[PDB]
């Protein structure tokens, strides 16, 4: 029916101050201008987030995979998986087309999984993905809320689907900037990818996807929530390798 | 008139066999599929050609942007820089839109100057762009050679224009992998892009533009040169940390 809040992480930051917009803040940095191009310290948080990501998703052992221009799942047509080889951990960074809450491009790092027959496998696989997402926020120290979509309503495709939502003090609310959701065999019905069973049956598998990270709504999420009085911006130390510093500040 | 040829870099490889094309090493170690995907260890080359360009321009100066996707000169529109400000040099990663050869989406990084008064100032540039190519596809281990492309014949919005052609062993051939172009005027006339003199006057300033890198023209020379006769491909020590190995062996 409705969204029902799994878990609170964080602490709203508290401030002696009216927070700024993200646009105000990137503006008196010089790190957005103009649509919108990043420039400095922003590229670099762009950068930073990316390869951020991207690295722990690695490290886990999710197989890289870089694609041209719904897509993950397209790429498995046609395709059968041996047993020995579920589940299936894919990781891709991709330009996708569709304030910088809303723009017509922008990078995004997937999570993409194949998994072995019925529900216990593709629960399993929804929830460590889900995992990843919240240590991968925690790290960033963000404050966030991890929120039941309900699937039967308002739509159908999706058995579960988990929305994470972090805290955008300019913005003043909560705005999604992940999402994680089991599709079962809807995709496999329709792509024909299949698994080959212990026994050796071809069987229609179970797919699972999560975004690993989107790049403007982090960007949101950070700069409003590092922000300080004097306009300035504190890294997060995880960005810290990336930026080279630990305070964004606004040049002369 | 026609391309002169003014240096050349390295040697080409010597086999004891014949050179096998890119999509054949790849589909034998499962890092080309498939249109066309990268996966696994051709992803990390990608990722990695990538991020050992940008970190090497940014240890160089160069200032980092990212856009929503030509589009470098366009960011700098009815923008006025500061004499003390010039030269002007940024970098950008983006996704580009136009075997491997010729997709229509892949990632290219990007040099782009803006720089004082003149065809002196402007030829600085681009010596250093192209140097700064130069050195980037020799600490690759690549043979190359670099020709110094006509412009009155044909084209015209170009002053002087280097294009570099990396050996292909399976191709048999040298291809374009890098360009770098001095534009002068040509694009600060058409899109207003001035700097101030010292002593007050607008005036419109030199462009110079440069590839950094393109993946699918390095990816081909690379796997095309380092190919052994096992099929396994040497990794250049400069790939090697994001790749984690020395040698790509083909899975079982």
């Known amino acids: 029916s409705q969204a029902r809040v799994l878990h609170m992480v964080g602490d709203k930051p508290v401030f002696s101050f009216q927070p700024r917009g993200h646009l105000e803040i990137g503006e008196k940095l010089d790190i957005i201008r103009q649509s919108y191009y990043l420039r400095g310290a922003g590229a670099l948080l762009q950068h930073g987030l990316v390869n951020f990501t991207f690295n722990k998703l690695l490290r886990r052992g999710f197989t890289p995979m870089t694609v041209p221009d719904v897509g993950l799942a397209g790429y498995f047509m046609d395709h059968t998986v041996a047993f020995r080889d579920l589940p299936v951990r894919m990781v891709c960074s991709s330009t996708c087309y569709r304030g910088l809450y809303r723009v017509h491009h922008f990078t995004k790092v997937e999570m993409f999984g194949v998994t072995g027959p019925g529900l216990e496998q593709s629960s399993q696989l929804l929830e460590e993905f889900l995992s990843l997402q919240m240590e ?3 790290e960033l120290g963000l404050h966030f809320r991890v929120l039941d979509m309900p699937t039967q309503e308002l739509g159908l495709p999706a058995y579960r689907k988990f929305d994470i939502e972090a805290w955008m003090p300019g913005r003043g609310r909560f705005g999604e900037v992940t999402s994680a959701s089991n599709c079962t065999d809807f995709q496999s019905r329709r792509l024909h990818i299949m698994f080959q069973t212990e026994a050796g049956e ?51």
């Open 202 to 252: 071809l069987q229609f598998a179970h797919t699972v996807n999560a975004t690993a990270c989107a790049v403007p709504r982090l960007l949101i999420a950070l700069l409003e929530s590092n922000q300080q009085k004097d306009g300035s911006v504190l890294v997060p130390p995880a960005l810290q390798s990336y930026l080279g510093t630990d305070r964004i500040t606004a040049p002369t």
């Open 136 to 138: 991968i926020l925690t």
